[PDB]
Design a binder for this molecule. Structure first.
Ligand SMILES: Nc1ncnc2c1ncn2[C@@H]1O[C@H](COP(=O)(O)OP(=O)(O)O)[C@@H](O)[C@H]1O
Ligand SMILES: [Mg+2]
Lengths: 47, 459, 600, 19, 459, 154
């Protein structure tokens, strides 16, 4: 809900920081996929 | 024979929580025992925690309420709490300090044993091998238990760990191709649970071989520090002198750890993690390790201690230190319980150290080891698939991921889920294992050698 | 017989020249004779926990040593009265001092000695008869609801030498004279019992009878039992005080002991004002509720040490009535305020703290408190049966169920009524989470339910499965956008909403939700589940045909049923009795069944 | 931190008593 | 009275932080006030927070900078901080220590009251049953204020919580369709805030009923934990002895909590959360619970303990512990302020724990409770719709969702937005409520019985 | 030749076990033999140090461990290597040490893991996910390292 509900620990810090980096990388890679699809879509729209 | 009169002191220095401090004491003996007579005639006992000069600090088991600093009489026994033990303690119920609660007599001192424990020479220790067939597929299949093992059941509050422990006790036995004596130490157990186990032993007709030590949640919290030592002291007598096989159940080492914390704080000791004494590791090792077999004897002690996990974690110092000492665990989870799965045992964070040697050709079935590993990996993957599905949806999975999801759902329904009044054998458990494994095409069963697959997989 | 004050650090006072003092003896500190209790003994100096504000206490003040420990006066005159944290009646103080403030150092008898009680002996005892602890040798009619049994105190026994004839006696007279071994004892109607000692019972029995709660949730899904223990660790605004007060107002218990330990002063006045206006018919006659309740006030702005006495006073009173054959359901609406008092005192004592500053023995105090609950066979020849239930609130900071008090409490209590602040923000009251809560008495009551209802248990199971499935879906639906949902899943989602909005929540300040008789809860649940099964079958049998009954088709066809189902709460059981409610629910079920026949 | 600080202060107090 | 001459000491044992430790003191009294003179003539005061034997620990209010060990002269008043109180304190301006700063004379007392006060006997406390009309729809409608109720405004740095409190002071009346004495404790604030309120009180033409207590950011931090009690002590005199209806407003209570935390650290007390004392709750209750009506007297005290939430953390101990004590909160946020919405009051996380009894037949209008509850449901769902729409897009919404988005948008600008000088009645507020509720069809208004919808909804 | 010490043995012997083992190792090192010393656990040794540090009422450092934990580990770990032995025969022996850090988790903030990593030249970290997948031996291959590359290149 509001939290993943992992008990506070230094282990949790490492996992959450790695999880955050993964989510941010996925966001950027999917954004690039969207941009590529949008350009082709717009080029396809004009066609 | 210590035929020397005992000294009794009124030289009380002061009382602080569970601790009574005495002065002017002649040659105090460390870990001695002192009997306290309160001004109103109440008798209580305690054990010396430290001595220095003419001073001694006494740990009072029944409680310190009502003790003054002028009239209370303190009798020093001159010895260490060596407790009376007898082979006929079975069929009896004792309180947390080893006294009758069942309207029977005081146990007749067939002999005395120092509850602190007598260390066993590792050279004479015999490695356990024989499998105990518990009837529970989550245990007999994957995390098998050898006789003489040390495998506690972890749980959090509210989970059915009392039912699992009771089920093991009445279904306990060996893999066949006669039974166990029970030593049951209740530490901080509520009355409803105490009647649960007491009735279950009676309903199954087991009491003839059960010795109970009941320290209930409404009983003194200092007393329970010795309770587990009294229980294992009896187990050691019965197993190593009376050639019995003893299964020892400890209802909660967490209430035990709290009792140590209460004392540690009271004597202003330097704590470690979360306020517990820095010596928690040692104090637990001296209890957990009272297990196994010894050369020249036919009996054994198997321990299955239970530990409540604060906040549902498994990094709390109590389960953390226990995990370093005991030979694996069961770990009863909550996610399985919320789904009405019983026994709700999570196979992934739970291991059994002796499993690799207590199974296989000559003990169970040739394929036991291979079936366990493959099932484990499949379950672990299924959980990683479920973790992905929760984000990408069921429409974003490939064919293999669906096979692991199908395994995951059927695994818990057909393999783990059992019921408390149904037992399955180790051979029946493996046959079910195969039914789950045959969900996958043989090419995906990468942890089973081809020879094993060719013998069993197509059946 | 006196010591002298050596120093003061706040709620903790140090005294000297008290070599003979024992732990947990009462003392009178200061010239106002403030009430305190000895915690530690260090040589001839004593550490005193003082239950009244210590401002103005000087070094050298006398300290009187009283041999008796902290104790409660037990006898007629308790019911209908309000007590402070050490059993000084507030209605007697306000009637005597004419003040609005509670003076410090007030020495007032717990039970008035002016009231002439109506006493009748059992008529079964004679001089020479052998009586033991718990025996009843007469009854006093405190009021028309509670018959006050006069018991022989525990740890007392002997032969009867005199029994007062029936008549009017006050609490200073002698009702029973008994002798044991030369020593003779004279007893009045009032006995004294140390508040920290558990009153002895013949046997602690399993709890096998529901504790009726005027709630749909907190009863249908998470039952409590007579003699059971539950916790409500709600954050502020979650409505846990309302749940406790509602349970007190509308339950099937005989006596309620309500303990306001650290509670706002306005909440205790609300009880004193509202309760006298409530009714509960006894035998065709209308009577007030207050005649069967008693309450203890130890408000947040009162001495912190007194918070411990309040908790133990409450349970001690509960046991006393338990011993008389009544079912008691006491509730302390705080718990955390008690543990907080222990922390503050432990600090002043310079003790080594444990988790988050709390004393290491916190778990010891909570365990021994809650274990005084339970259904018991009473001591005493008359063979009474009673119970004490404990419904204790907890106040976790931030609503985070991780503090030592919530954690320790959950390991003790057998019913967990977790509340969710995010439900209270939506005024979804009671704010029960229904995902993290549990009750370990489900199996115990299955026998009860089969005997009286039968239909309840399979309905309870189906309702839980629907709520769990909805939660499993919500986790993914938030990410998908309701695009991949099957028609069978949309039914779950919408019926689950139906259950959430109309069944699990109720407005306790209305004439219709103020009390929900159990038969109504199971009645309206049966209809909601019956709708689920009919809607799920309707699509399951048609999804593979040439016309699938999707949600949009059933929604438009049966839109009147979905509204009627939501209106089922508005039945006002006081104006419209059982006959109308059952007939109304039965008619809606028939209306639904006919709609499906015309739909499918 | 709190517990360790009090431990250090208690040690100093014990030392003063010994003098 | 105290007729015996006071003693003066030059026996200072030592100084440790804010605490001056005296020795050789005759019969020390706990919680007595000491006046001390520094070698340069500076006069300061403090309170004895501990006594032991001949020693006493004095906490100095002004501070311990410049306190000597040989020349410091201290005198013991022989009593607790009892302060002079009189009715004609209204119209006066005091500092945080209770001294005048308006160039007028000292208080000519009618009596001397103990700053610590006394708890009101719960048997004589009368439950609040009167409503105050604040004129703010966000309050009068969905979170009504009773006379004698405790309602702080939870705010955050930079938000106009000072303007809201000022507005409330002028347009707060009754719904019986009355002059409140206002006691305003300005503690831990800058000059501009104190001047803002002082000017507003004069601008409103109500200064004859306003008593100010100032304790500014550049004043000592120890006095900041007696100023509230000084304000409340006056309020108690006026309300319970002179039957005056008093409104007591305490400025950012967080400066009180921080001053309290400083004292807790200085005395090495057991911390709870974020370094605050484990007894913070009890101390807050001592301040907050000095409110409410008393049976048989026509006075009342209403409190508005406004506080700043550190870092907008609703779970910070300050708003957390307050939330547990007070009858709910108003709560403003930045999401409304950042859109130029005034007052920026967010109803969703707010509540009034007396509203259920202060509204309805005989108080306002019979549909009051029904309108409030349905508005809460519609507002919360509209917020849920935005949380969904942010991801799925507007095109993914159906007509069932757009209704809540329309409600949410019209709700905030029609119901909440008013302006600093917009004074609406409670009856107009409910009528506005209906104007928003009529956005939905009857079938969706599931919190309102048909016995109400049939009368009010048609319009 | 093994040295046997179980968890239920006294904390002082639990601490001394490592010192006894390495003493025997050096003894044979001075014979010209190549000695390979395997530890079961250095977290158990560090645990013994934490227990004794508490009992001695000395000021702790991170997570309750003594601040000198790193010094004890360096003393043990640096008693190894290929050497030219004392004695006329000019013989040359070696001691290899294989330590063993029981992982409370994959977070190397663990005082024992962290102090070891700053000392040891080769770290063979065992991946949790490979263990769960029953891929054996379980080695991460990404977080492990060996600082003897250039030494062995010849
Ligand atoms: N069951 C309920 N039914 C109706 N209203 C409720 C209910 N529970 C709480 N409320 C409302 O919410 C407020 C918060 O409840 P309260 O008991 O004061 O909270 P807390 O959890 O802090 O004790 C109540 O004053 C009332 O207005
Ligand atoms: Mg409350």
């Amino acid at each position: 809900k509001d939290r993943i509900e992992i008990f506070p620990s230094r282990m949790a810090q490492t996992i959450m920081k790695a999880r955050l980096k993964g989510a941010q990388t996925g966001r950027n890679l999917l954004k690039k996929k969207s941009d590529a699809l949008t350009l082709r879509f717009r080029q396809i729209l004009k066609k | 024979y210590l035929s020397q009169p005992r000294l009794t002191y009124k030289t009380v220095s002061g009382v602080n929580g569970p601790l009574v401090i005495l002065d002017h004491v002649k040659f105090p003996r460390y870990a001695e025992i002192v009997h306290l007579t309160l001004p109103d005639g109440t008798k209580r006992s305690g054990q010396v925690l430290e001595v220095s000069g003419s001073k001694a600090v006494v740990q009072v088991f029944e409680g310190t309420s009502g003790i003054d600093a002028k009239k209370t009489s303190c009798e020093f026994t001159g010895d260490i709490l060596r407790t009376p033990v007898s082979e006929d303690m079975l069929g009896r119920v004792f309180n947390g300090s080893g006294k009758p609660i069942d309207r029977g007599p005081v146990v007749l001192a067939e002999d005395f044993l120092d509850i602190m424990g007598q260390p066993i020479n590792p050279q004479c220790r015999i490695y356990p091998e024989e499998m105990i067939q518990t009837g529970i597929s989550a245990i007999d299949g994957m995390n098998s238990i050898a006789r003489g093992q040390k495998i506690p059941i972890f749980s959090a509050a509210g989970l059915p760990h009392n039912e699992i422990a009771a089920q093991i006790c009445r279904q306990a036995g060996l893999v066949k191709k006669e039974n166990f004596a029970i030593v049951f130490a209740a530490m901080g157990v509520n009355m409803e649970t105490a009647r649960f186990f007491k009735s279950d032993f009676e309903e199954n007709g087991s009491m003839d071989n059960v010795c109970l030590f009941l320290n209930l949640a409404n009983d003194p919290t200092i007393e329970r520090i010795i309770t587990p030592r009294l229980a294992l002291t009896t187990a050691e007598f019965l197993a190593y002198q009376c050639e019995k096989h003893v299964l020892v159940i400890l209802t909660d080492m967490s209430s035990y750890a709290e009792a140590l914390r209460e004392v540690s704080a009271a004597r202003e000791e330097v704590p470690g993690r979360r306020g517990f004494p820095g010596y928690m590791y040692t104090d637990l090792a001296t209890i957990y390790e009272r297990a196994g077999r010894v050369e020249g004897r036919n009996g054994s002690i198997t321990q299955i201690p239970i530990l409540t996990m604060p906040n549902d974690d498994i990094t709390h110092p109590i389960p953390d230190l226990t995990g370093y000492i005991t030979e694996g665990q069961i770990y009863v989870d909550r996610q399985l319980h919320n789904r009405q799965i019983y026994p709700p045992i999570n196979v992934l964070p739970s291991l059994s150290r002796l499993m690799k040697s207590a199974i296989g050709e000559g003990m169970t079935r040739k394929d036991h080891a291979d079936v366990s590993n493959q099932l484990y990996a499949c379950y672990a993957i299924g959980k990683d698939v479920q973790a992905m599905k929760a984000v990408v949806g069921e429409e974003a999975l490939t064919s293999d991921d669906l096979l692991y999801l199908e395994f995951l759902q059927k695994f818990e329904k057909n393999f783990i889920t059992q019921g408390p009044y149904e037992n399955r054998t180790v051979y029946e458990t493996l046959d079910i294992g195969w039914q789950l494994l045959r969900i996958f095409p043989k090419e995906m069963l990468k942890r089973i050698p081809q020879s094993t697959l060719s013998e069993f997989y197509p059946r | 017989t006196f010591g002298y004050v050596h120093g003061v650090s706040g709620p903790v006072v140090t005294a000297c020249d008290m070599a003979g003092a024992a732990m947990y003896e009462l003392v009178r500190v200061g010239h106002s004779e403030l009430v305190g209790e000895i915690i530690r003994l260090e040589g001839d100096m004593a550490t005193i926990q003082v239950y009244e504000e210590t401002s103005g206490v000087s070094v050298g003040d006398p300290v009187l040593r009283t041999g008796k420990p902290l104790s409660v006066e037990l006898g007629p005159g308790i019911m209908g009265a309000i007590f402070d944290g050490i059993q000084r009646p507030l209605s007697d103080i306000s009637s005597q001092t004419q003040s609005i403030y509670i003076p410090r150092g007030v020495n007032v008898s717990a039970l008035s000695r002016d009231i002439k009680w109506e006493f009748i002996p059992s008529k079964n005892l004679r001089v020479g008869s052998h009586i033991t602890g718990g025996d009843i040798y007469g009854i006093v009619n405190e009021n028309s609801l509670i018959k006050h049994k006069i018991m022989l105190p525990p740890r007392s026994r002997g032969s009867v030498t005199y029994i007062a004839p029936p008549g009017n006696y006050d609490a200073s007279d002698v009702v029973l004279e008994l002798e044991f071994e030369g020593v003779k004892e004279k007893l009045s109607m009032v006995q004294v019992w140390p508040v920290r000692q558990v009153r002895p019972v013949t046997e602690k029995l399993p709890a096998n009878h529901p504790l009726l709660t005027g709630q749909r949730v907190l009863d249908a899904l998470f039952p409590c039992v007579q003699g059971g223990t539950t916790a409500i660790p709600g954050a502020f605004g979650c409505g846990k005080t309302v749940i406790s007060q509602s349970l007190s107002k509308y339950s099937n218990s005989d006596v309620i002991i309500y303990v306001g330990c650290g509670e706002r002063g306005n909440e205790m006045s609300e009880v004193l004002r509202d309760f006298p206006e409530l009714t509960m018919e006894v035998d065709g006659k209308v009577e007030s509720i207050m005649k069967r309740t008693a309450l203890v006030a130890n408000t947040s702005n009162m001495p912190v040490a007194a918070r411990e006495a309040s908790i133990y006073t409450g349970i001690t009173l509960s046991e006393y009535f338990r011993d008389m054959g009544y079912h008691v359901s006491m509730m302390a609406d705080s718990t955390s305020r008690w543990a907080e008092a222990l922390r503050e005192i432990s600090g002043r004592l310079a003790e080594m703290p444990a988790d988050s500053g709390y004393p290491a023995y916190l778990g010891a105090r909570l365990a021994s408190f809650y274990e005084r609950a339970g259904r018991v066979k009473c001591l005493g020849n008359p063979e009474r049966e009673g119970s004490v239930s404990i419904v204790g609130a907890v106040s976790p900071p931030g609503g985070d169920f991780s503090d030592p008090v919530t954690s320790a409490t959950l390991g003790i209590v057998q019913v967990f009524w977790g509340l969710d602040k995010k439900l209270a923000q939506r005024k979804h009251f009671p704010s029960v989470n229904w995902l993290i809560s549990y009750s370990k008495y489900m199996r115990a009551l299955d026998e009860y339910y089969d005997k009286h209802f039968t239909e309840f248990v399979p309905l309870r199971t189906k309702a839980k499965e629907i709520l769990q499935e909805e939660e499993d879906l919500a986790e993914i639906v938030q990410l998908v956008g309701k695009a991949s949902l099957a028609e069978t899943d949309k039914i779950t989602l919408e019926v689950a909403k139906l259950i959430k909005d109309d069944f699990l929540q109720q407005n306790g300040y209305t004439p219709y939700d103020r009390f929900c008789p159990f038969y109504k809860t199971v009645g309206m649940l049966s209809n909601m589940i019956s709708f689920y099964d009919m809607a799920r079958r309707a699509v399951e049998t048609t999804a593979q045909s040439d016309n699938k009954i999707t949600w949009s088709i059933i929604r438009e066809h049966m839109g009147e049923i979905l509204y009627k189902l939501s209106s089922m709460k508005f039945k006002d059981p006081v104006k419209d009795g059982e006959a109308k409610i059952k007939a109304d629910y039965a008619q809606l079920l028939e209306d639904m069944q006919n709609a499906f026949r015309s739909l499918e | 931190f709190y517990r360790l600080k009090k431990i250090q202060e208690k040690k100093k107090i014990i030392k003063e008593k010994s003098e």
